[PDB]
A paper describes a structure:
To combat these defenses, Anopheles mosquitoes produce inhibitors belonging to the SG7 protein family that block complement at the alternative C3 convertase, C3bBb. Crystal structures of albicin and SG7.AF reveal a novel four-helix bundle arrangement that is stabilized by an N-terminal hydrogen bonding network. In this study, we describe the structures of albicin and its orthologs SG7.AF (from An. freeborni) and anophensin (from An. stephensi), characterize the binding and mechanism of AP inhibition by these inhibitors, and determine a role for properdin in modulating the inhibitory activity of SG7.AF. SG7 family members are quite similar to one another structurally, but amino acid sequence divergence suggests that specific side chain interactions are key determinants for the observed differences in target affinity.
Previously, we isolated albicin, a member of the salivary SG7 protein family from females of the malaria mosquito An. albimanus, which inhibits activation of the AP in human serum as measured by lysis of rabbit erythrocytes, blocks the cleavage of C3 and factor B in serum, and binds specifically to the C3bBb complex. The structure of albicin consists of a bundle of four α helices stabilized by two disulfide bonds. Helix α1 extends from the N-terminus to Thr 14 and is followed by a section of random coil that extends to Lys 22. The loop connecting helices α3 and α4 extends from Ser 78 to Ser 88, with α4 extending from Val 89 to the C-terminus. The two disulfide bonds link α3 and α4 with Cys 58 forming a disulfide with Cys 113 and Cys 81 linking with Cys 91. The N-terminal amino group of albicin participates in numerous intramolecular electrostatic interactions that appear to be important in stabilizing the overall structure, including three hydrogen bonds with residues forming the turn linking α2 and α3. The carbonyl groups of Val 45, Gly 46, and Tyr 48 form hydrogen bonds with the N-terminal amino group as does ND1 of the imidazole group of His 4 in α1. These interactions may be important for the positioning of the helical elements and stabilization of the helical bundle. The SCIN family structure consists of a bundle of three antiparallel α helices with a long dimension of ∼41 Å and an orthogonal short dimension of ∼14 Å, while the four-helix bundle of albicin has dimensions of 50 and 21 Å. We assessed the oligomeric state of the albicin-inhibited complex observed in SPR experiments using gel filtration chromatography after coincubation of C3b, factor B, and factor D in the presence and absence of albicin and nickel ion, which is known to enhance the binding of C3b with factor B. Albicin markedly reduced the retention volume for complex elution, indicating an increased molecular mass for the inhibited complex beyond that attributable to addition of the inhibitor alone.
Author numbering: 1 to 116
């Protein structure tokens, strides 16, 4: 219900990816989080009855893993980019598929623990 939506949106708003990173990188990283995690989780918890207990521990662990997954994306976009110059669109594109794959796997695991 809308109480669960509020709780989940507030937790997603705590995600700080470092807004001084390249604008086009942040656009991609945030869009992946939005489309692979925030929107599908909001769809799920919006359907709960208002009295249903949502596992905040489950959502908070999901948030923690987003930082790890985005940090990996950023390293491969920048200094650890192998085949192209750091910050190049090739580096972003070359790392983006795996970033999204990791977010999809995190979504699948998070779904299992959402209900307390
Ligand atoms: Br949403
Ligand atoms: Br329910």
């Amino acid at each position: 219900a809308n109480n669960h939506i509020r709780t989940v949106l507030k937790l997603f708003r705590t995600i700080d990816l470092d807004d001084s990173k390249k604008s086009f990188y942040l656009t991609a990283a945030k869009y992946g989080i939005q489309t692979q995690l925030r929107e599908p989780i909001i769809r799920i918890v919006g359907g709960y009855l208002p009295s249903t207990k949502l596992s905040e521990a489950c959502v908070k662990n999901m948030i923690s893993e987003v930082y790890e997954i985005e940090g990996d994306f950023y390293s491969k976009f920048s200094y650890a980019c192998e085949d192209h110059a750091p910050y190049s669109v090739e580096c972003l594109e070359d790392a983006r598929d795996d970033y999204l794959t990791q977010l999809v796997e995190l979504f699948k695991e998070t779904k299992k623990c959402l209900r307390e």
